[PDB]
Amino acid sequence: KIIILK
Amino acid sequence: KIIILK
Amino acid sequence: KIIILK
Amino acid sequence: KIIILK
Amino acid sequence: KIIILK
Amino acid sequence: KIIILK
Amino acid sequence: KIIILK
Amino acid sequence: KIIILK
Amino acid sequence: KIIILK
Amino acid sequence: KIIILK
Amino acid sequence: KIIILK
Amino acid sequence: KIIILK
Amino acid sequence: KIIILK
Amino acid sequence: KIIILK
Amino acid sequence: KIIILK
Amino acid sequence: KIIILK
Amino acid sequence: KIIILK
Amino acid sequence: KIIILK
Amino acid sequence: KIIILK
Amino acid sequence: KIIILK
Amino acid sequence: KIIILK
Amino acid sequence: KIIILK
Amino acid sequence: KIIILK
Amino acid sequence: KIIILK
Amino acid sequence: KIIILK
Amino acid sequence: KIIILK
Amino acid sequence: KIIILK
Amino acid sequence: KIIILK
Amino acid sequence: KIIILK
Amino acid sequence: KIIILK
Amino acid sequence: KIIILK
Amino acid sequence: KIIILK
Amino acid sequence: KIIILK
Amino acid sequence: KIIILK
Amino acid sequence: KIIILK
Amino acid sequence: KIIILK
Amino acid sequence: KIIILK
Amino acid sequence: KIIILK
Amino acid sequence: KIIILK
Amino acid sequence: KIIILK
Amino acid sequence: KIIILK
Amino acid sequence: KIIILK
Amino acid sequence: KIIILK
Amino acid sequence: KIIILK
Amino acid sequence: KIIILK
Numbered sequence: 141k142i143i144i145l146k
Numbered sequence: 147k148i149i150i151l152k
Numbered sequence: 153k154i155i156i157l158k
Numbered sequence: 159k160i161i162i163l164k
Numbered sequence: 165k166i167i168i169l170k
Numbered sequence: 171k172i173i174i175l176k
Numbered sequence: 177k178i179i180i181l182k
Numbered sequence: 183k184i185i186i187l188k
Numbered sequence: 189k190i191i192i193l194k
Numbered sequence: 195k196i197i198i199l200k
Numbered sequence: 201k202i203i204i205l206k
Numbered sequence: 207k208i209i210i211l212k
Numbered sequence: 213k214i215i216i217l218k
Numbered sequence: 219k220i221i222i223l224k
Numbered sequence: 225k226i227i228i229l230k
Numbered sequence: 231k232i233i234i235l236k
Numbered sequence: 237k238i239i240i241l242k
Numbered sequence: 243k244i245i246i247l248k
Numbered sequence: 249k250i251i252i253l254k
Numbered sequence: 255k256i257i258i259l260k
Numbered sequence: 261k262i263i264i265l266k
Numbered sequence: 267k268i269i270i271l272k
Numbered sequence: 273k274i275i276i277l278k
Numbered sequence: 279k280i281i282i283l284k
Numbered sequence: 285k286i287i288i289l290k
Numbered sequence: 291k292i293i294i295l296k
Numbered sequence: 297k298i299i300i301l302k
Numbered sequence: 303k304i305i306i307l308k
Numbered sequence: 309k310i311i312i313l314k
Numbered sequence: 315k316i317i318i319l320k
Numbered sequence: 321k322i323i324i325l326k
Numbered sequence: 327k328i329i330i331l332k
Numbered sequence: 333k334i335i336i337l338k
Numbered sequence: 339k340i341i342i343l344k
Numbered sequence: 345k346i347i348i349l350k
Numbered sequence: 351k352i353i354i355l356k
Numbered sequence: 357k358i359i360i361l362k
Numbered sequence: 363k364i365i366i367l368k
Numbered sequence: 369k370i371i372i373l374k
Numbered sequence: 375k376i377i378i379l380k
Numbered sequence: 381k382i383i384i385l386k
Numbered sequence: 387k388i389i390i391l392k
Numbered sequence: 393k394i395i396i397l398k
Numbered sequence: 399k400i401i402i403l404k
Numbered sequence: 405k406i407i408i409l410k
Contacts, residue, residue: 146152151157161173162168178184187193197203206212216222218230234240241247251257260266268280271277281314288294295301306312314320325331328334340346347353358370378384386392397403403409
């Protein structure tokens with residue numbers, strides 16, 4: 141559901 | 147559902 | 153659904 | 159942002 | 165942003 | 171963010 | 177589907 | 183399916 | 189499925 | 195008295 | 201008094 | 207009084 | 213929001 | 219928004 | 225929110 | 231009802 | 237009933 | 243019933 | 249000096 | 255100086 | 261000086 | 267709000 | 273709002 | 279709020 | 285009353 | 291009374 | 297009575 | 303530099 | 309540099 | 315450098 | 321503001 | 327601010 | 333601020 | 339360089 | 345190089 | 351090099 | 357506020 | 363506001 | 369506030 | 375990239 | 381990349 | 387990368 | 393005085 | 399004096 | 405006196 145990259 | 151790249 | 157790049 | 163109701 | 169109801 | 175109700 | 181009633 | 187009564 | 193009732 | 199759906 | 205659905 | 211659902 | 217005075 | 223006074 | 229004085 | 235006096 | 241004096 | 247005086 | 253009602 | 259009612 | 265009611 | 271200087 | 277200086 | 283200086 | 289000097 | 295010097 | 301000097 | 307009165 | 313009065 | 319009064 | 325992507 | 331993606 | 337993905 | 343596919 | 349698939 | 355699949 | 361650079 | 367550079 | 373650099 | 379003076 | 385002077 | 391002076 | 397080079 | 403170089 | 409170099 142949630143994937144985040146920085 | 148969420149993918150974010152910075 | 154959300155794909156955002158900066 | 160996402161909100162869903164079913 | 166997106167909002168869904170169905 | 172995601173919020174879901176069934 | 178949604179039903180709301182009063 | 184959603185139901186609300188009052 | 190959900191019922192709220194009073 | 196308040197009923198709000200998103 | 202208050203009902204809120206998201 | 208208060209009833210809140212998410 | 214609700215505010216009541218009586 | 220609702221506000222009541224009576 | 226609710227505030228009451230009576 | 232409300233009465234205010236000074 | 238609300239009374240205020242000064 | 244509410245009374246304030248000073 | 250300040251008197252405010254809602 | 256300050257009177258506030260809600 | 262300070263009188264507050266809610 | 268009140269501010270006083272004398 | 274009240275602002276006083278005298 | 280109140281602020282006073284003499 | 286107020287005096288300011290520089 | 292207020293006096294400011296510099 | 298307030299005096300400030302420098 | 304900064305003199306402020308209210 | 310700074311002299312603030314309220 | 316810094317002087318403040320309230 | 322500087323924003324770069326290449 | 328700077329943001330880079332390569 | 334700086335953020336990098338490579 | 340960047341590639342995105344779905 | 346950045347690649348995203350779904 | 352970044353690769354993501356689902 | 358003051359900002360100085362020399 | 364005051365801003366100085368010299 | 370004051371900020372200085374020499 | 376970022377040079378800022380105030 | 382970043383240089384800030386105040 | 388990051389250098390800041392105040 | 394200020395002198396800046398790159 | 400301020401000098402910066404790169 | 406300030407010097408920065410890289």
